[PDB]
Design a protein around this ligand. Structure first.
Ligand SMILES: *[C@@H]1O[C@H](CO)[C@@H](O[C@@H]2O[C@H](CO)[C@@H](O[C@@H]3O[C@H](CO[C@H]4O[C@H](CO)[C@@H](O)[C@H](O)[C@@H]4O)[C@@H](O)[C@H](O[C@H]4O[C@H](CO)[C@@H](O)[C@H](O)[C@@H]4O)[C@@H]3O)[C@H](O)[C@H]2NC(C)=O)[C@H](O)[C@H]1NC(C)=O
Ligand SMILES: *[C@@H]1O[C@H](CO)[C@@H](O[C@@H]2O[C@H](CO)[C@@H](O[C@@H]3O[C@H](CO[C@H]4O[C@H](CO)[C@@H](O)[C@H](O)[C@@H]4O)[C@@H](O)[C@H](O[C@H]4O[C@H](CO)[C@@H](O)[C@H](O)[C@@H]4O)[C@@H]3O)[C@H](O)[C@H]2NC(C)=O)[C@H](O)[C@H]1NC(C)=O
Ligand SMILES: *[C@@H]1O[C@H](CO)[C@@H](O[C@@H]2O[C@H](CO)[C@@H](O[C@@H]3O[C@H](CO[C@H]4O[C@H](CO)[C@@H](O)[C@H](O)[C@@H]4O)[C@@H](O)[C@H](O[C@H]4O[C@H](CO)[C@@H](O)[C@H](O)[C@@H]4O)[C@@H]3O)[C@H](O)[C@H]2NC(C)=O)[C@H](O)[C@H]1NC(C)=O
Ligand SMILES: *[C@@H]1O[C@H](CO)[C@@H](O[C@@H]2O[C@H](CO)[C@@H](O[C@@H]3O[C@H](CO)[C@@H](O)[C@H](O[C@H]4O[C@H](CO)[C@@H](O)[C@H](O)[C@@H]4O)[C@@H]3O)[C@H](O)[C@H]2NC(C)=O)[C@H](O)[C@H]1NC(C)=O
Ligand SMILES: *[C@@H]1O[C@H](CO)[C@@H](O[C@@H]2O[C@H](CO)[C@@H](O[C@@H]3O[C@H](CO)[C@@H](O)[C@H](O)[C@@H]3O)[C@H](O)[C@H]2NC(C)=O)[C@H](O)[C@H]1NC(C)=O
Ligand SMILES: *[C@@H]1O[C@H](CO)[C@@H](O[C@@H]2O[C@H](CO)[C@@H](O[C@@H]3O[C@H](CO)[C@@H](O)[C@H](O)[C@@H]3O)[C@H](O)[C@H]2NC(C)=O)[C@H](O)[C@H]1NC(C)=O
Ligand SMILES: Cc1cc(-c2[nH]c3ccc(C4CCNCC4)cc3c2C(C)C)cc(C)n1
Ligand SMILES: Cc1cc(-c2[nH]c3ccc(C4CCNCC4)cc3c2C(C)C)cc(C)n1
Ligand SMILES: *[C@@H]1O[C@H](CO)[C@@H](O)[C@H](O)[C@H]1NC(C)=O
Ligand SMILES: *[C@@H]1O[C@H](CO)[C@@H](O)[C@H](O)[C@H]1NC(C)=O
Ligand SMILES: *[C@@H]1O[C@H](CO)[C@@H](O)[C@H](O)[C@H]1NC(C)=O
Ligand SMILES: *[C@@H]1O[C@H](CO)[C@@H](O)[C@H](O)[C@H]1NC(C)=O
Ligand SMILES: *[C@@H]1O[C@H](CO)[C@@H](O)[C@H](O)[C@H]1NC(C)=O
Ligand SMILES: *[C@@H]1O[C@H](CO)[C@@H](O)[C@H](O)[C@H]1NC(C)=O
Ligand SMILES: *[C@@H]1O[C@H](CO)[C@@H](O)[C@H](O)[C@H]1NC(C)=O
Ligand SMILES: *[C@@H]1O[C@H](CO)[C@@H](O)[C@H](O)[C@H]1NC(C)=O
Ligand SMILES: *[C@@H]1O[C@H](CO)[C@@H](O)[C@H](O)[C@H]1NC(C)=O
Ligand SMILES: *[C@@H]1O[C@H](CO)[C@@H](O)[C@H](O)[C@H]1NC(C)=O
Ligand SMILES: *[C@@H]1O[C@H](CO)[C@@H](O)[C@H](O)[C@H]1NC(C)=O
Ligand SMILES: *[C@@H]1O[C@H](CO)[C@@H](O)[C@H](O)[C@H]1NC(C)=O
Ligand SMILES: *[C@@H]1O[C@H](CO)[C@@H](O)[C@H](O)[C@H]1NC(C)=O
Ligand SMILES: *[C@@H]1O[C@H](CO)[C@@H](O)[C@H](O)[C@H]1NC(C)=O
Lengths: 737, 737
C-alpha cells in the first residue's frame, strides 16, 4: 500500500504534515505534489532514484525553505517546478536547464540575476509575482537577464516594486504580466521587439484604491498612467489588454491604430465617465468581444441617466458589455440606442448601479440578447486569496449555467421588489431563466404575477417572504422545470392553511424543487401529494421532527405521492427518530437518500427492503451508536454508504462480507477502537480517519486484511492515528511493526 | 450560609435543578421563588413552618405538577401565588382565601368552576391565559363564576377558545383582557355593569394574520369583528382600548360617544386605509395621546402619497402617532397638514413604509417634534416568547434613550443612503440625535456632509462602509459627544493612509467613541493621539495583536494621547501577549479596563502600579494559567476583578489578605481544585462555580473559611460541583460532612 502518498502516474502527497521528503515514493512516479507540508530542507539526496519525475510541487513549505546549490540538477527529466510561498531570499542556484515551467511566487527574491535564470534557456512559463512587494525598495533586474531566455512565452512580474518596464525582453513573448508594478510611465521603446505579444497586463499602476485584498497606493496628485501615443505601435498581435485601476481620464484612440485583433479590453476602476459619453477609441475596436468599464463612477455623483456614446455601434464583434458601478437613477430606451444595432451582443452587466427605474421594453430591441444582469439595483414594484486570479474582472458566470442553459436569462436579484406588481414584467422578451433572489418579496402567489413571461423553465425565488399556499400559485409557468424557494420565510402564516403545497401537483414538467430552510412544521394538504415529473426534492432545514412526531400521525405519507422521485434531501430536520411507517411511505423509486446532519439516535435497517433502487444512503453527522449484521437481507443495490461523524463503537461480524453491491463505505470520525476478522467483495473505498484506534495486538488482524485487500483504497492514511498506548499515540496504524 | 436559596426578605431559589421543595429555607422568609426547577409534587408538608410567606413562585415545574387539595390552605399570609406552565388539568382545589394575585397561565385548565375560584373573594389580579388554546374545543365558564369575586380589578382570559364574552362580570373590574378568544360578535349586554373599566383588550379576534408567534385563523369569508353601536355606551372610564388584528374596515364614531378619557387606541393589523382618509371617529377623541394604525396597508397597493384625514387636527392631546406598514412612495408637506396643528405631537413612527422620497421641510412645521422615526424605508442619496407581552404594539423605545436625551432625534437607518448627498439634510430641524445605521453608506467623510445639521451630539453610523481617513471628517459637528462607528468595513483601503484617526483630535466635546469590529490592523497617525474630552473608547473586535507585534514598535503609544480616558474596551483583539512598554503607555486616568475574550497566555500584574484610579479589570475568556501573590504592592484601588473562563489551577498564598479595596472577585469556570488557608478584607462577592473541585480533606480548610466569612456572598452554590471522587461527584462543596 502506497504510504504516505496516494498513487493515481501522479502521486498526491500534499497536506500530510511531512517534516521531510518521503523516501517511500516509487521510482515509476512522474508527478509528485508535496505542497502544504512542514518540509524545511531540500538536498540532492531528497529526490534520489527518481529520474522519471517531470513535475515537482513544493508550495507553502514549511507551514523558510533551505535548498542546496544543484539539489534538482540530478533530475534530467524535470520540466515543471513549483516553488511558491517558501520565503526564498534569492533564486535557487544550479536549477536544471530541462525546465519549461517555473513558479517562484510569494518569496523574498529581491534580485533577478544571470547566475540563477539565464542558464534556463528551455523556460516557456516564468512566474516571479509577489516577491519585492511592500517590504522593498526596488526589484533589481539585471540588464538583459531575460534576453537569453529565447523560448519564453509567458513572463509574470506582477506585484513587485519595478518602477520601469524591464529592458531587453525576448521576442518569443506571447503573454506579459506587469500588474501593480509601480510603473507610472510607458514609452515606445518599452515594448519595441515584442511582435508576437497577444496579452499585456498593466493593471494596478497608478490605481483607484477600492476593495482590494492587496495593499493599494495611488500616484501623487491623483496621477494617471502616462502611456505614449506610439507605445503600442508594434503590438499587432495583441488580443488581451488589461488597463484596470490605472486612474485614466482619457483614452488615446492612437493606442489601437496597429491593434486590429484586440478581443478583450479591461478599463474598470478608472475615471472614464467622460470617455463613455464620447469615445474616439470605440471606432478603433471592430474585433473587440469583451469590454469592461465597471466602477468608473464619479465620487458623489448620482445622475438621472447613463451617457452612452453613439460610437458604441462601431463595436460590431462585441459579445459582452460590463457597465457595473457607473451609478445612475433611470435607464430609458433612448440611452441604449447605440448598442441595439450590435448583432453579437449577448451579455449586458448593469449590476451595482442603484437604478430606480428601467424601461424593460428596451431589451426586446436587441438582436441576440441572452444575459440581462440587473442585480444589486433599486427596481421596486411596477404598478399601474490566490495570486493566480483575475482581481479586477469577475470570472464567475453572472447567472448559474443551469439557469442560463434554458434560454434568455434575466437577473433582478437584490432589488426593491417587495411584491410582484401587475406591470412588473411588462414588454419583456421570452425569458426562460429568472432570478428574484433576496428582494424581500412578500407576494401572495395566485397565478397572475408571471403572466407576461409564461415560458420560464428555471425560477430562482430564494431569500424572499413569498406565500405559495394558493393551489394556483406559479401555475401560469406551465414549462417550469426548476423552482428554487430556498430560505423562504412565510410572513402571513395561517393555522389550517400554511403550508399548502398543492401547487406542485399542477406542473407537468417540474423536475427539481428546493424548499430548503422554509421552516415547514405544519402541512394542510388533506390528500398527499402527487407529482409524476419531480425527480429531486430538497426538504433540508425544515421541521420533519414536528411533522412525524404528530399525535394523530397525519403527515406519515408526506412524500408517498412523489412516485417519480430519485433524490431526496432530508438533512438538518432535527430528526431524533424516523417512525417505521413514515420511512416505508417514502418513494420506492429513490436512488439517493440524504438524512445527514440530524440527531438520529437509532436507524431501522430492516426498512431498506422496500427500496430496491437505493444506491446512495447519507447518514453523516448523526448520533447513531450501532450497525446491523444482516445488511445483505435488507439491501442488494446500495453502492455508497456515508456514516461519518457518528458514535459507532463496533463493526458487526459479517458486515463487509454481506453487501456485494457496496463500493464506498465511510466510517471516519466515529468511536471505533478495533476491526476484527469476523467483521472483515466489490468495495473500492473505505474511510476510517479520525477514529480512536487501539494500536495493540488486536489491530493486527485488520492490518493483515489491508495487505490482502490492496484494491480497497483507504484515503488519508496519515489521519488514521492511534489513540492508545502513549508510545503509539500520534502514529499511523500502517506504520506499526 | 443559605442553601440552596440565596437570601436578600426575598429568597431566590430558581433554576437550581430542585427535584423537591427544600426544607432548608428559613421561617423568616416572606418571598420564595422556586421557578424553573424539576419539582413534581406539592403537599401540605412542602411549606411547613413558613407562616410568614406572602409570595410563592412555582412556574415551569417540572422542566405535570401534582398539587394535593388544600396544600397551600395552611398559609394564612399567602397573597401572591404563581402557577404558570405546570400542565395543570384543573384549577387547584382548596386554595387560600387570603390570595390577591393568582396566575394560572399555560396549563391544561378547560373548566372555570365555582369549586375552585368562587371561594377566593380577596382576588385582585387573575390570569387565566393560554389554557384552552388550540387543543380545545371551548372553555367552559360556569354561570356567574366571577360574580362572587367583588374585589377583582384585573381579569385576563386571553388566548382561550371562548367564542362569547363571559356573562355576570364584577363591577370592580378596571382591566379586562380578551385577546385571541374567538369572540366574533360584541353586544350591548357584554360590558353592561362595568362602570369602572379603564382597559379593554379585544385584539386578535377575527384577525389579519401576520408574523405572529402564536397560531392565527381568520374568520370565515374575510369577516371583521362585529361590535354593536351601543356596546361601549357605559364604559365612561375607559383609557386603553386594544382593537388590533380585528380585520376592521370601518370604525363607528358612536363607540367613543361615552368615552371622553380614552388615552391609548390600538388599531394595528386591520384594513382601515379608507378610515385613515376619512375618519369621523377622530373628532370623538380629544383626550387621546397614543394612536397606532400600523400595518393597515391594502395588499398589492403601493400608492404615491399617504391620505391623512383633516379630522386628525381634532386629536389635540396626541403625543404619539404610529403609521408603520401603510406602504406609500412619496411623503409631501401637504399630506401631513392636519398633524402640523397638534401641540403635544412629539413622536411620528413611519417605519416599514418603503418611502422613496420625503420632503424633509415638513418636519420643521411641527410645534413640539422630538422623535422622527423613518427606519426600514427607501430614502436614497439626495442630489442636486412570553405571554405577558404586547404582541401587536412595540414597547421598545424607537430611538435609544441615550441618543434621544440630547434633543431632536431622526432615525434614517436601514434605508438606501449608499452615500451622503449634498442635499441629504436640506431644510431639516435642529437634530441633536441621528441614526444612519445599516445604510451601506460608503461616503468619504470630508466635513461637508453634515453641514445642514451641525448641532448633532449623538451620531450612529454603525454597519456602514465609511471612510474617515481625512483629518476634517465629521469636524462640522463641533458639539458631537457620542460617535458610534461599530461594524464599519473600509471599502477603499490605502496603504500608508488607512487607518487615519486624526479627526478625533479636533473634537472639543467628544466623550464616547465606538470603533468596534472595524478590523483596524494598520495605523498611519504619525503623531499619537491627543483628545482632552474622551472618557470612553471601544476598540473591541480589532487587530491589536498585529499593531503591538510590529517589528518597528510604531503603535506602542496607540492610546497615550487620551489623557481623560476612564473606560477602555480591548476585547476580541486576538491578543496572546501585551508588550510591557505598550501596557505602560495606556492612560493612567483609567477606572475600567476590559481585556476579555482574547488569548492572553500571560499577564504582568507589576504594570498595575502606573494605574492608581483602576477600579475594574476584566480578564475573562483568556488562557491565563497563574496569578500573583504580591497584588497589594501593585494595586490599592482595584474593586472588581473578573477572571472567569481561564486556566488558573492555583490561588497564591496571601491573595485575599493583600488587596483591601477588592470587593468582587470572579474565579468561576477555571481549573481550581482546592483553596488553602494560606491563600485565604472588604470582599462582598466571590464567584467559583464550574471549577473541578477535589471534595476530599484538603477542601475542609476552605469550607471553614466560608462559615467564618458569611458576608462574602458566593453565588449559585449548586453549580459549585465536585469533580472527584466518584461518590462525591455532582454534589455541592457545601453539602459535605
Ligand atoms: C488582466 O487581464 C488579463 C486578461 O483578462 C488577466 O489574465 C488572465 O488571468 C487568469 C488568472 O491568472 C488566467 O487564468 C488561468 O488560465 C490558465 C490556463 O487555462 C486556459 O487553458 C486551459 C487549457 O490549457 C483551458 O482549459 C482553460 O479554459 C483556459 O483557457 C489556468 O491553468 C488557470 O487555472 C488555475 O485556476 C484553476 C481554478 O482555481 C485551478 O484549478 C488551476 O489548477 C489553476 O491554478 C487560470 O484559469 C487567464 O488565462 C488570463 N488570461 C489569458 C487570456 O491568458 C489578468 O489576470 C488580469 N490582471 C489582473 C491583475 O486582474
Ligand atoms: C436548491 O436545490 C438544487 C437541487 O439540489 C440546487 O441546485 C443544484 O446545485 C448543485 C450544486 O450544489 C449542482 O451540482 C453541481 O453541478 C456542477 C455542474 O454540472 C454540470 O457540469 C459537470 C462538469 O463540470 C457535468 O458532469 C454535469 O453533468 C453538469 O453538466 C458540477 O460541476 C458539480 O459537481 C461537483 O460537485 C459535486 C458535489 O456537489 C461532486 O459530487 C462532483 O464530483 C463535483 O466535484 C455539481 O454536480 C446542480 O447542478 C444544481 N441543480 C440545478 C437544477 O440547478 C440549488 O443550488 C439549491 N439552492 C440553494 C440556494 O441551496
Ligand atoms: C458602542 O459603544 C457604546 C459605549 O460603550 C455603547 O453604548 C453604551 O452601551 C451600554 C450597554 O452596552 C449602555 O449602558 C446601559 O445603560 C442603561 C441606562 O443607563 C442610564 O440610566 C440609568 C438609570 O436607569 C443610570 O443609572 C445610568 O447612569 C445611565 O444614565 C442601563 O440600564 C444598562 O444597565 C444594564 O447593564 C448593566 C451592566 O452593564 C447591569 O448591571 C444592569 O442591571 C442592566 O442590565 C447599561 O448600563 C450605555 O449607556 C451606552 N452608552 C451610550 C453613550 O450610548 C454602544 O451600544 C456601542 N455600540 C454597539 C453597536 O455595540
Ligand atoms: C440569483 O442571485 C443570487 C444573488 O445575486 C445568487 O447568489 C449568489 O450565488 C453565488 C454562486 O453560488 C455565490 O457565490 C459563491 O460564494 C462562495 C463563497 O460564499 C464561493 O465559494 C463560490 O465559488 C467560488 O470559489 C470557487 C472555488 O472554490 C471558484 O471556482 C468560483 O469561481 C468562486 O470564486 C461562489 O462565488 C454568492 O455568494 C451568492 N450571493 C448571494 C447574495 O446569495 C444566485 O446564485 C442566483 N441564482 C441563479 C440561478 O443565477
Ligand atoms: C392590547 O393593548 C393593551 C394596552 O396597550 C396591552 O396591555 C398591556 O399589556 C402589557 C403586557 O401584558 C402590560 O405590561 C406589564 O405590566 C406589568 C405591571 O406593570 C409588568 O409587571 C410587566 O412586566 C409588563 O410590563 C401593560 O401594563 C398593559 N397595559 C396597561 C395600560 O395595562 C395588551 O397587552 C395588548 N394586547 C395584546 C395581545 O397585544
Ligand atoms: C439605530 O438603528 C438600528 C437599526 O434599527 C438600531 O439597532 C437595533 O438595536 C436594537 C436594540 O437597541 C435591536 O432590537 C432588539 O433588541 C432586543 C434586546 O434589547 C432583542 O431582544 C431583539 O431580538 C432585537 O434584537 C435591533 O436588532 C438592532 N438592529 C440592528 C439592525 O442592529 C440601533 O440601536 C439604533 N441606534 C440608536 C442610537 O438609536
Ligand atoms: C462616495 C460614493 C459611494 C458609492 C457607493 N456606495 C456603495 C454601497 C454598497 C455597495 C455594494 C452593494 C452590493 N454589495 C456589496 C457593496 C457599492 C457602493 C458604491 C459604488 C457603486 C462602489 C457611489 C457613488 C456615486 N459615490
Ligand atoms: C403583497 C404586498 C406585500 C407588501 C410587503 N412586502 C414586504 C417586504 C419586507 C417587509 C419588512 C421590511 C423590514 N424587515 C422585516 C420585513 C414588509 C413588507 C410588506 C408589508 C409592509 C407587510 C406590501 C404591499 C402593499 N403588498
Ligand atoms: C541550509 O542547509 C545547509 C546544509 O549544508 C546548511 O549548511 C545551512 O546552514 C542551511 N541554511 C539555513 C538558512 O538553514
Ligand atoms: C513597426 O516595426 C516595423 C519593423 O521595424 C516597422 O517597419 C514599422 O514602421 C514599425 N511601426 C511604427 C508605427 O513605427
Ligand atoms: C461576431 O460578429 C461578426 C461580425 O462582426 C460575425 O462575423 C461573427 O460570426 C460573430 N460571432 C459569432 C460567434 O457568431
Ligand atoms: C427600438 O424599438 C422601437 C420599437 O420597436 C423602435 O421604434 C426603435 O427604432 C428601436 N430602436 C433601435 C435603435 O433599435
Ligand atoms: C387564489 O388565487 C385565485 C386567483 O387569483 C384567487 O381568485 C383566490 O381568491 C386566491 N385564494 C385566496 C384564498 O385568496
Ligand atoms: C420521471 O418522469 C419522467 C416523465 O415525466 C420519466 O421519463 C422518468 O423515467 C421518470 N423517472 C423515474 C425514475 O421513474
Ligand atoms: C423495524 O420496523 C418494523 C416495522 O416496520 C419492526 O417490526 C421492527 O422491529 C423494526 N426494527 C427496529 C430495529 O426498530
Ligand atoms: C398526586 O399525589 C397523590 C399523593 O397522595 C397521589 O395519590 C396521586 O396519585 C398523584 N397523582 C398524580 C397524577 O401524580
Ligand atoms: C347603560 O347606558 C345607558 C345609556 O347611557 C343607561 O341608560 C343605562 O342605565 C346604563 N347601564 C348601566 C348598568 O350603567
Ligand atoms: C397635552 O395637550 C393638552 C391640550 O390639548 C395640554 O393641556 C396638556 O398640557 C398637554 N400635555 C403636556 C404633557 O404638556
Ligand atoms: C408649513 O410651513 C409652511 C412654510 O413655513 C407654511 O407656509 C405652511 O402654512 C405650514 N403649514 C402648516 C399647516 O403648518
Ligand atoms: C479631505 O477633505 C477636504 C474637504 O472636503 C478635501 O478638500 C480634501 O481633498 C480631502 N482629502 C482627500 C485626500 O481627498
Ligand atoms: C478633559 O481633560 C481636561 C484637561 O485639562 C480637563 O480640564 C477636563 O475636565 C476633562 N474633561 C472631561 C470630560 O473629563
Ligand atoms: C513586567 O514588566 C517589567 C518591565 O516593565 C519587567 O521588568 C518585569 O520583569 C515584567 N514581569 C513579567 C511577569 O513579565
Amino acid at each position: 500500500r502506497s504510504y504516505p502518498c496516494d498513487e493515481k502516474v501522479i502521486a498526491e502527497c500534499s497536506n500530510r504534515r511531512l517534516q521531510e521528503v518521503p523516501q517511500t515514493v516509487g521510482k515509476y512516479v512522474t508527478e509528485l505534489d508535496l505542497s502544504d507540508n512542514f518540509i524545511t530542507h531540500i538536498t540532492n539526496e531528497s529526490f534520489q532514484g527518481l529520474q522519471n519525475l517531470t513535475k515537482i510541487n513544493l508550495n507553502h513549505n514549511p507551514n523558510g525553505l533551505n535548498i542546496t546549490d544543484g539539489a534538482f540538477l540530478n533530475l534530467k527529466n524535470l520540466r515543471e517546478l513549483l516553488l511558491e510561498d517558501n520565503q526564498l531570499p534569492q533564486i535557487p542556484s544550479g536549477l536544471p536547464e530541462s525546465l519549461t515551467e517555473l513558479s517562484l511566487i510569494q518569496n523574498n527574491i529581491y534580485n533577478i540575476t544571470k547566475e540563477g535564470i539565464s542558464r534556463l534557456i528551455n523556460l516557456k512559463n516564468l512566474y516571479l509575482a509577489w516577491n519585492c512587494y511592500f517590504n522593498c525598495e526596488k526589484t533589481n533586474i539585471e540588464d538583459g537577464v531575460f534576453e537569453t531566455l529565447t523560448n519564453l512565452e509567458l513572463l509574470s512580474l506582477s506585484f513587485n516594486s519595478l518602477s520601469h518596464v524591464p529592458p531587453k525582453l525576448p521576442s518569443s513573448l506571447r503573454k506579459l504580466f506587469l500588474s501593480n508594478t509601480q510603473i507610472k510611465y510607458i514609452s515606445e521603446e518599452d515594448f519595441k521587439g515584442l511582435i508576437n505579444l497577444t496579452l499585456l497586463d498593466l493593471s494596478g499602476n497608478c490605481p483607484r484604491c477600492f476593495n482590494a485584498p492587496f495593499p493599494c497606493v495611488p500616484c501623487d496628485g491623483g496621477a494617471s498612467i502616462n502611456i505614449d501615443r506610439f507605445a503600442f505601435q508594434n503590438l499587432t498581435q495583441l488580443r488581451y489588454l488589461n488597463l484596470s485601476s490605472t486612474s485614466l481620464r482619457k483614452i488615446n484612440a492612437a493606442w489601437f491604430k496597429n491593434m486590429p485583433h484586440l478581443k478583450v479590453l479591461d478599463l474598470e476602476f478608472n475615471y472614464l465617465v467622460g470617455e463613455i459619453a464620447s469615445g474616439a477609441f470605440l471606432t478603433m475596436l471592430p474585433r473587440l468581444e469583451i469590454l469592461d468599464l465597471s466602477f468608473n463612477y464619479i465620487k458623489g455623483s448620482y445622475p438621472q441617466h447613463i451617457n452612452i456614446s453613439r460610437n458604441f455601434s462601431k463595436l460590431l464583434s462585441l459579445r459582452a458589455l460590463h457597465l457595473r458601478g457607473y451609478v445612475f437613477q433611470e435607464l430609458r430606451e433612448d440611452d441604449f440606442q447605440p448598442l441595439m444595432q450590435l448583432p453579437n451582443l449577448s451579455t449586458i452587466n448593469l449590476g451595482i448601479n442603484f437604478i430606480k427605474q428601467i424601461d424593460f421594453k428596451l431589451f426586446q430591441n436587441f438582436s441576440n440578447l441572452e444575459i440581462i444582469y440587473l442585480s444589486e439595483n433599486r427596481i421596486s414594484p411596477l404598478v399601474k486569496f490566490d495570486p493566480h486570479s483575475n482581481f479586477y474582472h469577475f470570472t464567475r458566470p453572472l447567472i448559474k449555467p443551469q439557469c442560463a442553459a434554458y434560454g434568455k436569462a434575466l437577473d433582478l436579484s437584490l432589488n426593491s421588489i417587495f411584491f410582484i406588481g401587475p406591470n412588473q414584467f411588462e414588454n419583456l422578451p421570452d425569458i426562460a431563466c429568472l432570478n428574484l433572489s433576496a428582494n424581500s418579496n412578500a407576494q401572495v402567489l395566485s397565478g397572475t404575477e408571471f403572466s407576461a413571461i409564461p415560458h420560464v423553465k428555471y425560477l430562482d425565488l430564494t431569500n424572499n417572504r413569498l406565500d405559495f399556499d394558493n393551489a394556483s400559485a406559479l401555475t401560469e409557468l406551465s414549462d417550469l422545470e426548476v423552482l428554487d424557494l430556498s430560505y423562504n420565510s412565510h410572513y402571513f402564516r395561517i393555522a389550517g392553511v400554511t403550508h399548502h403545497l398543492e401547487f406542485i401537483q399542477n406542473f407537468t414538467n417540474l423536475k427539481v424543487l428546493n424548499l430548503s430552510h422554509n421552516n415547514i412544521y405544519t402541512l394542510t394538504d388533506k390528500y398527499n401529494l402527487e407529482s409524476k415529473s419531480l425527480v429531486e426534492l430538497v426538504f433540508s432545514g425544515n421541521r420533519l421532527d414536528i411533522l412525524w412526531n404528530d399525535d394523530d400521525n397525519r403527515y406519515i405519507s408526506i412524500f408517498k405521492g412523489l412516485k417519480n422521485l430519485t433524490r431526496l434531501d432530508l438533512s438538518l430536520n432535527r430528526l431524533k427518530h424516523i417512525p417505521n411507517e413514515a420511512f416505508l411511505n417514502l418513494p420506492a423509486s429513490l436512488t439517493e437518500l440524504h438524512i445527514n446532519d440530524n440527531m438520529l439516535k437509532f436507524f431501522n435497517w430492516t426498512l431498506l427492503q422496500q427500496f430496491p433502487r437505493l444506491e446512495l444512503l447519507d447518514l453523516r453527522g448523526n448520533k447513531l451508536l450501532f450497525l446491523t449484521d444482516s445488511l445483505s437481507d435488507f439491501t442488494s443495490s446500495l453502492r455508497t454508504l456515508l456514516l461519518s461523524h457518528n458514535r459507532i463503537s463496533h463493526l458487526p461480524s459479517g458486515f463487509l462480507s454481506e453487501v456485494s453491491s457496496l463500493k464506498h463505505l465511510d466510517l471516519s470520525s466515529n468511536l471505533l477502537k478495533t476491526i476484527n476478522k469476523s467483521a472483515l467483495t466489490k468495495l473500492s473505498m473505505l474511510e476510517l480517519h479520525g477514529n480512536p484506534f487501539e494500536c495493540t495486538c488486536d489491530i493486527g488482524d485488520f492490518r493483515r486484511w489491508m495487505d490482502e485487500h490492496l484494491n480497497v483504497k483507504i484515503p488519508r492514511l496519515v489521519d488514521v492515528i492511534c489513540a492508545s498506548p502513549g508510545d503509539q499515540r500520534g502514529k499511523s496504524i500502517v506504520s506499526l511493526e
